[PDB]
């Protein structure tokens, strides 16, 4: 959510319904932004994931409102996108088949990953289980580094 200028087209009619929902998200983000001086590394990353997951949830909310629930108007949605309450790219990915669930965009860039391949969270849990069984071990991981993703839930 950006800052209201003269160049900001004001929010259309149906925004008054949703404001308090995404307001909460905003508040959370504010809470999630501060020097919570985690000496630890893993926990520090955890905080970051809290922001990431929160972002996902907010965007996911707007996506739901637009597409699954089919409630809010198109203009309103557009406005929201422009203001960036919800990430557009993420939504686009969601709309595409296979990524119906998707933590975030960073988990599907094969360039960034040292092995030219997606984030392990994208591997469906069942597959991982199968692999583990074959090997003998259990699910080695619980959440990837890029975001707090205990499975990315393609299924």
């Amino acid at each position: 959510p950006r800052i209201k200028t003269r160049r900001s087209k004001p929010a259309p009619d149906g925004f008054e319904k949703i404001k308090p929902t995404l307001t909460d998200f905003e508040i959370q983000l504010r809470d999630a932004q501060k020097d919570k001086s985690s000496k630890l590394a893993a926990k520090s990353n955890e905080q970051l994931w809290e922001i990431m997951q929160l972002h996902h949830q907010r965007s996911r909310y707007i996506y739901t409102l637009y597409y699954k629930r089919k409630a809010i108007s198109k203009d309103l949605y557009d406005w929201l996108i422009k203001e960036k309450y919800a990430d557009k790219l993420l939504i686009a990915k969601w709309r595409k088949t296979g990524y119906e669930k998707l933590c975030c965009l960073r988990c599907i860039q094969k360039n960034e990953t040292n092995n030219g391949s997606t984030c392990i969270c994208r591997v469906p849990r069942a597959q991982l289980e199968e692999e583990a069984r074959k090997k003998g071990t259990q699910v080695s991981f619980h959440q990837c580094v890029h975001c707090g993703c205990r499975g990315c839930a393609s299924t």
């Binding site: 209201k4 590394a41 972002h55 990430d87 975030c104």
Partner: protein, 143 residues
Amino acid sequence: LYTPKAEMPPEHLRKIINTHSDMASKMYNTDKKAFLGALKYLPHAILKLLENMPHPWEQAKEVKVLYHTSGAITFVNETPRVIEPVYTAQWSATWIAMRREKRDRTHFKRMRFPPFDDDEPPLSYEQHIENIEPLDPINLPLD
């Protein structure tokens, strides 16, 4: 096998920056090295930032930005391009607006320099600025 970068949540970046003010652990030991490395490119970053100075008619200019995962640097990736005649028009309007202001105002308070004292740190964009609304920019009122 390519795809574009992730338009990340800027909140993430903010969080990272917040984290790297109280830096004093073996956690982010290599991030300090990262910071040192970034001095190479800090002048480049500066240039980009000054390149996308919001012109005096832009109230609150957003911009795309690359930033190190450890928040050791914050580039201003967007190139600040403009339709030349349009640009001239904008500056002309600000030229006349500014001139008008000069005309009307009996005294004209300038900013004291530098703006902040050595004790006062760089105030957080989220805590102070992001809440409060900006004043109206300069632009002569058009018919």
